């Protein structure tokens, strides 16, 4: 039950305006044949061009919305739209390109997909709101066959070249002209009422409709992300490592310990309200503070309202509140906050629904749109490094460190020791790693690193 059987029925009602007379009774087997492809009763890793919802969710990094609009059916030009914002016009002789024959259009498609996907996934999943022209145009830039490996590496093959008769992955596809063994899924098979725009606009106000193919491609993928990662959530699905996931996650634990420990030392809060992930552990386990946990799963739709989190019947105004990746609409003044900036560009952060983003780091977290007004009661947390550890070098070469933000006994004494200089530069790299990944740090306005110097006396 892991792959989509080709004998599964395909609802054709959405196709009958582009393809009048299409049979109501239709399987994927007959649909693929109708699209001009032949599968040959082949057991070589490619059982179906179309995939299940579950397989699509596991390969969300490969999702490319795809739409085709009749520009004027073999006799008229076609506008090819992709969720990358690209519009290509193919002739049978926000970006918008003029009409060109299929033999040059397919070269642009391979280049576009390869640059988009090489650092994201081992494949492409075309996300469709299928009405006909997009399915019948695939024969002009798609080749299928047995699963293969790249001619220059061990990755699976995603492209084919008619010039050299060879195969390549996204990384080595320069000059290739055909997409090889792509995957696809028709969102309209999921049981919607009404057209694409009416269903998309139920949940998203960020993507308009300029009535060009790329806008439909964007809305289609956006609707799919909402259905699979907003209204539905599955945190059991694991995703492969494609970047600095481990360093980013390790940096997050180190910065969280550093910031909370220093806030407790500087202001001596009697109680800390740890609001968020119900799997949370004390990040400063040796602190004397009264540590109270409050369970809140990561919100995937709208940011939590602070009124429903705190109230409905309790003294969150006592001490300090810790919101580590707990997105609320407005943080109280006595808060320590880590909030993911959905606007960040990285291979881990995919475009999301209604201004949000889909952050995929081991697991997929759809995150509500970043909002600067949520931090009005707070200020940005400045960088600093604090350590009460002994100045002792145990066991890399050294240039003396000078920094006003190395809060250690040795710097209080006027000369940073080598150990705390090593730890400072290691923490600075971790801090910059986490900030670059899109995380932002905010703190109550009274926070002052000057209060940490007298923790050495
Ligand atoms: Zn390769
Ligand atoms: Zn949208
Ligand atoms: Zn030192």
Swiss-Prot record:
Native source organism of the sequence: Severe acute respiratory syndrome coronavirus 2 (2019-nCoV)
Lineage: Viruses, Riboviria, Orthornavirae, Pisuviricota, Pisoniviricetes
Residues bound to Mg(2+) 1: 67, 134
Catalytic activity as recorded in UniProt: a 5'-end (5'-triphosphoguanosine)-ribonucleoside in mRNA + S-adenosyl-L-methionine = a 5'-end (N(7)-methyl 5'-triphosphoguanosine)-ribonucleoside in mRNA + S-adenosyl-L-homocysteine
Region (GpppA-binding) location: 353-367
Binding site for Mg(2+) 2: 69, 211, 216
Active site: residue positions: 67, 69, 134, 211, 216
Signal peptide: none
Shown part of the complete sequence: 5949 to 6449 of 7096
Subunit structure: Interacts (via N-terminus) with DDX1. Interacts with nsp10.
Residues in N7-MTase domain copies: 239-457
Function: Plays a role in viral RNA synthesis through two distinct activities. The N7-guanine methyltransferase activity plays a role in the formation of the cap structure GpppA-RNA. The proofreading exoribonuclease reduces the sensitivity of the virus to RNA mutagens during replication. This activity acts on both ssRNA and dsRNA in a 3'-5' direction.
Binding locations of Zn(2+) 15: 200, 204, 207, 222
Positions annotated to bind Zn(2+) 16: 391, 410, 417, 420
Regulation of this protein's activity per its record: Inhibited by Remdesivir antiviral drug (GS-5734).
Residues that hold Zn(2+) 14 according to the record: 150, 153, 169, 172
The name this protein goes by in its record: Guanine-N7 methyltransferase nsp14
Binding site residues for S-adenosyl-L-methionine: 274-280
Residue span(s) of domain ExoN: 49-230
Annotated compartments: Host cytoplasm; Host endoplasmic reticulum
């Amino acid at each position: 039950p892991t792959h989509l059987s080709v004998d599964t029925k395909f609802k054709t009602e959405g196709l009958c305006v582009d393809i009048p007379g299409i049979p109501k009774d239709m399987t994927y087997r007959r649909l693929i044949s109708m699209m001009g492809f032949k599968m040959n009763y082949q057991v070589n890793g490619y059982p179906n061009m179309f995939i299940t919802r579950e397989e699509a969710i596991r390969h969300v990094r490969a999702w490319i919305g795809f739409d085709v609009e009749g520009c004027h059916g073999t006799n008229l030009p076609l506008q090819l739209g992709f969720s990358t914002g690209v519009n290509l016009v193919a002739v049978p002789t926000p970006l918008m390109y003029k009409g060109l024959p299929w033999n040059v259009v397919r070269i642009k498609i391979v280049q576009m997909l390869s640059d988009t996907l090489k650092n994201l996934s081992d494949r492409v999943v075309f996300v469709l709101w299928a009405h006909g022209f997009e399915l019948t145009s695939m024969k002009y830039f798609v080749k299928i066959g047995p699963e293969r490996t790249c001619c220059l590496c061990d990755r699976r093959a995603t492209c084919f070249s008619t010039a050299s008769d060879t195969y390549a992955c996204w990384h080595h596809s320069i000059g290739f002209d055909y997409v090889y063994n792509p995957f696809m899924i028709d969102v309209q098979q999921w049981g919607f009422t009404g057209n694409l725009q009416s269903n998309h606009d139920l949940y998203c106000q960020v993507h308009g409709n300029a009535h060009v193919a790329s806008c439909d491609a964007i809305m289609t993928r956006c609707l799919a992300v909402h259905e699979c990662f907003v209204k539905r959530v599955d945190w059991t699905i694991e995703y492969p490592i494609i970047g600095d996931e481990l360093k980013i996650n390790a940096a997050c634990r180190k910065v969280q310990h550093m910031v909370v420990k220093a806030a407790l030392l500087a202001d001596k809060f009697p109680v800390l309200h740890d609001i968020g992930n119900p799997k949370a552990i004390k990040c400063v386990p040796q602190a004397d503070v009264e540590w109270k946990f409050y369970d809140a799963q990561p919100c995937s739709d709208k940011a939590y309202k602070i009124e429903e989190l705190f109230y409905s019947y309790d003294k969150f105004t006592d001490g300090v509140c810790l919101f580590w990746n707990c997105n609320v609409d407005r943080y109280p003044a006595n808060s320590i906050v880590c909030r993911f900036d959905t606007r960040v560009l990285s291979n881990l952060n995919l475009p999301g629904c209604d201004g949000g983003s889909l952050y995929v780091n081991k697991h997929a977290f759809h995150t509500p749109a970043f909002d600067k007004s949520a931090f009005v009661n707070l200020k940005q947390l400045p960088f600093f490094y604090y350590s009460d550890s002994p100045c002792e070098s145990h066991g890399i070469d050294y240039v003396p460190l000078k920094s006003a933000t190395c809060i250690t006994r040795c710097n209080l004494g006027g000369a940073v020791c080598r150990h705390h200089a090593n730890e400072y530069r290691l923490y600075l790299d971790a801090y910059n790693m986490m900030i670059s990944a899109g995380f932002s740090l905010w703190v109550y306005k009274q926070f002052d690193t000057y209060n940490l110097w007298n923790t050495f006396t």
